[PDB]
Amino acid sequence: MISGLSHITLIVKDLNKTTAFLQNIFNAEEIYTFSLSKEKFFLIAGLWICIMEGDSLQERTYNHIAFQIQSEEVDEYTERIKALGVEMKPERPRVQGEGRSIYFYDFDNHLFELHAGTLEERLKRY
Amino acid sequence: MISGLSHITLIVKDLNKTTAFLQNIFNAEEIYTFSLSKEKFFLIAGLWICIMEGDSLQERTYNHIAFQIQSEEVDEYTERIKALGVEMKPERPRVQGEGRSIYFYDFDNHLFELHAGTLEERLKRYH
Numbered sequence: 001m002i003s004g005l006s007h008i009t010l011i012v013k014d015l016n017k018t019t020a021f022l023q024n025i026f027n028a029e030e031i032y033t034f035s036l037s038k039e040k041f042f043l044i045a046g047l048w049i050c051i052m053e054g055d056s057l058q059e060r061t062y063n064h065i066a067f068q069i070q071s072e073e074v075d076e077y078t079e080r081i082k083a084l085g086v087e088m089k090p091e092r093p094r095v096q097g098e099g100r101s102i103y104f105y106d107f108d109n110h111l112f113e114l115h116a117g118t119l120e121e122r123l124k125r126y
Numbered sequence: 127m128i129s130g131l132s133h134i135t136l137i138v139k140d141l142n143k144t145t146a147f148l149q150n151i152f153n154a155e156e157i158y159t160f161s162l163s164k165e166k167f168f169l170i171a172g173l174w175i176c177i178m179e180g181d182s183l184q185e186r187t188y189n190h191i192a193f194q195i196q197s198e199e200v201d202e203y204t205e206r207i208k209a210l211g212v213e214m215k216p217e218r219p220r221v222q223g224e225g226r227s228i229y230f231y232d233f234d235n236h237l238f239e240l241h242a243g244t245l246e247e248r249l250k251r252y253h
């Protein structure tokens with residue numbers, strides 16, 4: 001029986017730029033040979049994430065990891081993501097009680113989401 | 127916040143094939159339209175996973191989601207995966223006290239891992 005999530009691993013080109021992304025946006029906590037595949041582990045809210053050198057290097061897709069946030073800090077988060085100059089999907093016009101998410105990319109084509117409110121998939125607003 | 131993981135959403139060609147992958151292998155529990163993109167949610171050991179029908183494929187990389195299993199279940203899961211017929215990166219020879227992982231794909235070029243033992247990334251073993 002599956003006992004829990006063990007980790008997620010992502011391949012990026014540049015571990016320092018991805019480190020900056022994970023620390024600035026998610027307050028990722030970094031835990032820790034001449035390798036060509038250098039790597040790093042972080043914890044973000046109970047999740048172990050490995051970043052390892054490789055190729056950014058795919059296509060963009062709608063696959064994504066969503067992290068939960070409070071509704072009250074959606075605007076703050078949006079401003080930090082905007083500070084990294086990464087690609088964001090502009091938030092659309094919204095009605096009251098419509099739960100908010102932010103969709104945006106890292107430097108290697110991965111799509112992330114910060115999700116507040118009721119669990120659901122919101123990509124179809126874009 | 128970051129309170130925790132909200133969910134992971136995977137895009138797949140055929141929701142029925144993927145349902146069988148997730149259910150036969152991970153014992154995923156299905157949760158709760160006329161869209162030409164429907165969706166399902168499943169729960170796997172507390173992770174909320176959504177799958178959503180889309181495009182056709184995506185090339186293969188080493189980005190992967192790894193779930194935790196126990197060392198005494200590795201061979202059994204290995205069987206459950208081969209029985210489904212999915213592509214699997216076969217276990218290499220191994221020494222005593224090294225933990226085992228199984229790396230295998232779904233039907234849509236997503237890499238998954240069942241990881242027993244000590245946390246580390248094990249991709250280098252397949253080089």
Ligand SMILES: [Mn+2]
Binds near residue numbers: 064066113120
């Ligand atoms: Mn989502």
Ligand SMILES: [Mn+2]
Binds near residue numbers: 239
């Ligand atoms: Mn791994």
